[PDB]
Ligand binder design. Structure first.
Ligand code: NAG
Ligand code: NAG
Ligand code: NAG
Length: 261
């Protein structure tokens, strides 16, 4: 719907929380809740894309295309050598490739296609970034600002720098809007580059499950215990949604009626 823009060059903790609430406010389906939890809308909606513009300390920018139904990064842009440069993942083609390309790069302005030769799946990025897992790849507000300069406007960048760039951007924008916990981690360490602890990652790989448990779980009694992880790698066992509600920002779409309240 509307282009949300975050400035990682000149940002604070109270600039990130608004951008997140903006993200959350803009990504969420005005009519779909769950235990005081906004839930994302289903595939077919009025609007279907989010535009998030990131400003670098270097003042350069890099835009990002998010499906607002799920919040996966469909493609990112950057003005390079007097034209709109659109980057689309390789498993994205056809018409949704057009809607991604024609959105980031108006079909009336000079454009250059620079294909992403892989997908936006964590094991994938992890392997385009040289890691066996993303926790080896640091996060930070000034890590996203720096990453933006290495890329935006550059005629030549590597796949290593790119997927790592993609690891921190999909984690500091996409995962943090889905998770209050993740947004707090980045907010907690807003001055230091941090390795993401086990709960950041568990929650990442467990959104579909958590959103689903919270959905059909009356009175606050999830359907069956939920196995997660605390920050320290130990096992966490959720039973009631007001238990794992704090950490949740947005709920994935789950067809039907869940306790609105
Ligand atoms: C950052 O934004 C503040 C206001 O939020 C502004 O006063 C300041 O000049 C900006 N910093 C720059 C431009 O280096
Ligand atoms: C979800 O989709 C099915 C598909 O036919 C539809 O019939 C159903 O009413 C929707 N809601 C639920 C709770 O299944
Ligand atoms: C929305 O997409 C089209 C609308 O032209 C149609 O298939 C249907 O209304 C929706 N599609 C699905 C898969 O629900």
């Amino acid at each position: 719907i509307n282009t949300i823009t975050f400035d990682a060059g000149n940002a604070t903790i109270n600039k990130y929380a608004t951008f997140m609430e903006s993200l959350r406010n803009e990504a969420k389906d005005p009519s779909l809740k769950c235990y005081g939890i906004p839930m994302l809308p289903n595939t077919n909606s009025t609007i279907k894309y989010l535009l998030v513009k990131l400003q670098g300390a270097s003042l350069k920018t890099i835009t990002l295309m998010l499906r607002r139904n799920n919040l996966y990064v469909m493609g990112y842009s950057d003005p390079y050598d007097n034209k709109c440069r659109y980057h689309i993942f390789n498993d994205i083609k056809g018409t949704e490739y057009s809607d991604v390309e024609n959105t980031l790069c108006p079909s009336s302005n000079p454009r250059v296609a620079k294909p992403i030769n892989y997908n936006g799946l964590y094991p994938t990025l992890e392997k385009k970034a040289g890691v066996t897992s993303r926790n080896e790849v640091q996060l930070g507000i000034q890590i996203l600002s720096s990453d933006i300069g290495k890329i935006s406007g550059q005629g030549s960048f590597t796949e290593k720098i790119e997927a790592k760039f993609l690891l921190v951007a999909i984690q500091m924008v996409s995962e943090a809007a889905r998770f209050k916990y993740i947004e707090n981690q980045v907010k907690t360490n807003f001055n230091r580059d941090f390795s993401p602890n086990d709960k950041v990652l568990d929650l990442e790989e467990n959104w579909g499950k958590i959103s689903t448990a919270i959905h059909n779980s009356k009175n606050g009694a999830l359907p069956k215990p939920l196995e997660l992880k605390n920050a320290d790698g130990t096992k966490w066992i959720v039973l009631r949604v007001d238990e794992i509600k704090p950490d949740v920002g947005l709920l994935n779409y789950v067809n039907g009626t869940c306790q609105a309240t």
